[PDB]
Design a protein around this ligand. Structure first.
Ligand SMILES: CCNS(=O)(=O)c1ccccc1OC
Ligand SMILES: CCNS(=O)(=O)c1ccccc1OC
Lengths: 237, 300
């Protein structure tokens, strides 16, 4: 059934599962034409496919050439996502394949189910959570690499860096969702919080700064404040 | 004109014959139905006055034998039987007509309703859906489940309709996932029409039989089958023009005949609004769209 507040710790059991977000697959800028009409120009996008237990981020870059000459691109994007997810699973060995795929938007259910007919023992599930994975393109290294691609490409990151050496996957996922929720509500403030202290660096292979445990607590607190605020600055409370 | 005699009417029962019906009181001197048109299948069906649970009945074709009804007090129902002794049967029927203890199949001459509802329905195909080969006629009731329903429990008593499943490998060619799922023409035209049914007449015949079992017995699996077969055509971009014209006539007469008070359970909002307003065939079912809008505008 649907993944929600009540069955949240299931994400961190030992059954392999992937979270698929398609928000950033089809991305456009909207502009005026010389005649004063409106047109779209596509830009590179990405499928965000994440193992929430291990932190593996399988980032399939969607190059704008895949849209050339195609119609109804928002609908195609869901089928392209499902095609690429099915291909990733088929490549994986049987023991490394996921038993569940949770899609963050309900409109991905039928495209993924059809592309996975060959895998009847993989459950495709929606979720009732309003997860902030759309903000993955606010992660500097992600925004930069998806925009530099000149061809379709599969990019790999650990979205938890080395956190699992010190914290559990439940705690790492909670930290990720807070950082991403913050970046989604106010990207400027969020990024200021993360990079204010020049002495804390980002390792070449990491997405986030090398915070100590104590510094993460401060950081996590500041991100909570941001989100409560922006909720005030938005709802005047 | 053929006749279905009754041995007797020991229990109070509503008897239907095709779209007609009449009430028979307990131990009323009823001895059957005469003047039944030859050339069409027919259904004779029953609802007991005590237990309106279980509508049941028999599909039959008078050209395939002499058939009669006899109540069984052990199994508690009116049973169809074949009489093999031809002279015994003509003799029984003639005596009952003489004493005028048979009702007359009350077909108005202008009326083509039953023909229009059973145009493509054949006994031989009914008998492969309802498997009971020692009999020339077929029993159906409200509770019988379909083979597809049983995949999701007694097989001898199942409705073996053709399984349609839009999210199945049969329906979806590898490499055409989006194409085949959004445009079901290859599943309609190649898998089902060319492959399984052979021609559109057989497809229409099963569609019509499914509707009639849904209407006369409230058989839910049959209603699921009728809507699935509709939806498969409506969700195909490429349909022979002759099939679309005939489908419009088929559904027109089904919607015309449906009791106004059963439409809440027997009509699936989603399939109909898709057929009539979203699907490829939103512009191809003019007669059906006009009767649905004037008779069931709430559904839409
Ligand atoms: C393969 C680069 N290392 S990783 O940790 O970022 C990772 C990403 C995706 C899949 C598996 C991974 O590690 C085993
Ligand atoms: C310490 C290596 N880490 S890395 O993966 O980011 C990397 C790989 C290869 C060359 C330079 C690199 O980083 C500056």
């Amino acid at each position: 059934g649907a993944m929600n507040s009540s069955n949240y710790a299931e994400l961190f059991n030992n059954d392999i599962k992937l979270f698929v977000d398609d928000t950033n697959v089809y991305r456009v800028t909207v502009h005026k034409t010389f005649e004063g009409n409106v047109a779209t120009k596509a830009i590179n996008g990405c499928i965000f496919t994440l193992n929430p237990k291990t932190g593996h981020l399988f980032l399939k870059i969607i190059h704008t050439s895949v849209w050339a000459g195609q119609k109804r691109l928002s609908q195609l994007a869901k089928w392209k996502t499902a095609e690429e997810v099915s291909a990733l699973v088929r490549s994986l060995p049987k023991e490394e394949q996921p038993k569940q795929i949770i899609v963050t938007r309900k409109a991905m259910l039928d495209p993924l189910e059809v592309h996975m007919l060959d895998f009847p023992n993989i459950a495709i599930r929606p979720t009732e959570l309003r997860l902030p994975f759309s903000a993955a393109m606010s992660i500097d290294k992600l925004s930069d690499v998806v925009m530099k691609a000149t061809e379709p490409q599969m990019v790999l990151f650990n979205i938890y860096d080395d956190w699992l050496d010190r914290i559990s996957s439940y705690t790492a996922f909670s930290r990720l969702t807070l950082l991403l929720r913050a970046l989604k509500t106010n990207e400027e403030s969020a990024k200021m919080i993360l990079l204010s202290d020049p002495t804390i660096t980002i390792k070449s292979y990491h997405l986030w700064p090398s915070f100590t445990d104590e510094q993460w607590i401060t950081i996590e607190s500041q991100m909570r404040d941001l989100i409560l605020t922006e909720y005030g600055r938005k709802y005047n409370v | 004109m053929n006749t279905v005699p009754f041995t007797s009417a020991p229990i109070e029962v509503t008897i239907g014959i095709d779209q007609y019906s009449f009430n028979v009181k307990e131990n009323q001197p009823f001895h059957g139905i005469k003047d039944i048109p030859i050339g069409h299948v027919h259904v004779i069906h029953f609802q007991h006055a005590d237990n309106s649970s279980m509508r049941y009945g028999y599909w039959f074709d008078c050209r395939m034998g002499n058939f009669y009804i006899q109540y069984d007090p052990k199994d508690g129902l009116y049973k169809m039987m074949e009489e093999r002794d031809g002279a015994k049967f003509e003799n029984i029927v003639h005596n009952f007509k003489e004493r005028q203890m048979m009702v007359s199949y009350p077909k108005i001459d202008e009326d083509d309703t039953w023909y229009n509802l059973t145009e493509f329905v054949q006994m031989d195909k009914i008998r492969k859906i309802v498997r009971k080969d020692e009999n020339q006629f077929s029993y159906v009731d409200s509770s019988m489940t379909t083979v597809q329903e049983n995949e999701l429990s007694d097989p001898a008593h199942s409705l073996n309709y053709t399984v349609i499943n839009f999210k199945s490998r049969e329906a979806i060619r590898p490499g055409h996932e989006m194409e085949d799922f959004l445009d079901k023409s290859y599943y309609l035209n190649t898998v089902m029409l060319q492959g399984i049914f052979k021609n559109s007449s057989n497809y229409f015949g099963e569609l019509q039989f499914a509707f009639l079992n849904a209407m006369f017995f409230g058989n839910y699996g049959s209603s699921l089958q009728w809507h699935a077969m509709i939806e498969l055509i409506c969700s195909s971009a490429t349909v022979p023009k002759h099939m679309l014209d005939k489908l419009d006539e088929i559904l027109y007469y089904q919607i015309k005949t449906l009791p106004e008070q059963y439409s809440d359970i027997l009509l699936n909002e989603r399939v109909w609004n898709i057929c009539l307003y979203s699907s490829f065939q939103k512009n191809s079912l003019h007669n059906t769209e006009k009767i649905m809008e004037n008779k069931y505008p709430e559904l839409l």
